[PDB]
Design a protein around this ligand. Structure first.
Ligand SMILES: [Ca+2]
Length: 102
């Protein structure tokens, strides 16, 4: 039988929230996704969801996440975004609460 463990995220924000200032410029990195694969398998990171993907771009290899559009606490003060990590055998997708700060 095949021998594989799926990756898991290690960012603490997955258990709290990710704070991003509403004055964060478009193009800014807002975090870097971190994960461990116990087999040391190469990992790819992603974002899923139509809205999430319009607002946030993920570097598949490094896990850096950039803001694609302006934030505005007035229009939307919070997002629930799903981030993913895969070893090509399986994928973990986790929700994170993104708080837009004033
Ligand atoms: Ca693995």
């Amino acid at each position: 039988m095949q021998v594989n463990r799926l990756p898991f995220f290690t960012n603490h924000f997955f258990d709290t929230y990710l704070l991003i200032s509403e004055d964060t410029p478009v193009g800014s990195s807002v975090t870097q996704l971190l994960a461990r694969d116990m087999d040391n398998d190469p990992l790819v990171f992603g974002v899923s969801g139509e809205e999430a993907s319009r607002f946030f771009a993920v570097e598949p290899d490094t896990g850096v996440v950039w803001l694609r559009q302006p934030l505005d606490r007035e229009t939307k003060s919070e997002f629930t975004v799903e981030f993913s990590v895969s070893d090509h055998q399986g994928v973990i997708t986790r929700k994170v609460n993104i708080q837009v700060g004033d």
